[PDB]
Amino acid sequence: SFSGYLKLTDNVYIKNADIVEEAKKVKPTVVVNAANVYLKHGGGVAGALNKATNNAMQVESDDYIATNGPLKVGGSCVLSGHNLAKHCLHVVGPNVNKGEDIQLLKSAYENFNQHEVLLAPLLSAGIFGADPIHSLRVCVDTVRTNVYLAVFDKNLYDKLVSSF
Numbered sequence: 001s002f003s004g005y006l007k008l009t010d011n012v013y014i015k016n017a018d019i020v021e022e023a024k025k026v027k028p029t030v031v032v033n034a035a036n037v038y039l040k041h042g043g044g045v046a047g048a049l050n051k052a053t054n055n056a057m058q059v060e061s062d063d064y065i066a067t068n069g070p071l072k073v074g075g076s077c078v079l080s081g082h083n084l085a086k087h088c089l090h091v092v093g094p095n096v097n098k099g100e101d102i103q104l105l106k107s108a109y110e111n112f113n114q115h116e117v118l119l120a121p122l123l124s125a126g127i128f129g130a131d132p133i134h135s136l137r138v139c140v141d142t143v144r145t146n147v148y149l150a151v152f153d154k155n156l157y158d159k160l161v162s163s164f
């Protein structure tokens with residue numbers, strides 16, 4: 001079970017933690033990946049989750065893309081969680097540094113509603129370029145299931161909690 005989380009709402013929890021370390025500790029049913037449409041896990045949360053699976057997440061993802069083609073921005077797919085979780089829900093939030101519509105962030109969070117409980121990062125935050133305060137607001141206003149948010153950066157975590 002999840003420990004050390006600060007309760008924000010009835011169903012949204014938050015902790016200053018490395019999502020990879022959190023995944024290895026809890027081994028949740030679902031870990032959310034901050035994915036791109038091609039499932040190319042190069043950097044940010046995706047690169048870090050993929051490196052923890054010894055690249056097994058990338059090999060599985062390339063086979064998925066070869067069969068199904070790319071995901072949509074705002075969409076998702078369920079793949080193996082490997083050594084991190086039972087499953088990994090690869091969710092594509094809009095990448096602001098690629099001109100993608102920030103309005104698609106609500107659609108991306110709607111994917112979380114298909115899972116009772118999830119360990120997740122803030123969608124479109126970090127190298128995706130969106131404001132993390134805005135991502136947290138869309139998360140609490142869109143997700144109805146139990147979401148345990150891992151925020152890597154302490155300074156950002158403090159800013160998110162203090163401004164909520």
Ligand SMILES: CS(=O)(=O)Nc1ccc(C(N)=O)cc1
Binds near residue numbers: 018020044126152
């Ligand atoms: C900034 S974030 O959106 O919280 N996502 C990250 C979390 C962890 C790591 C890592 N372990 O390298 C990278 C990015």
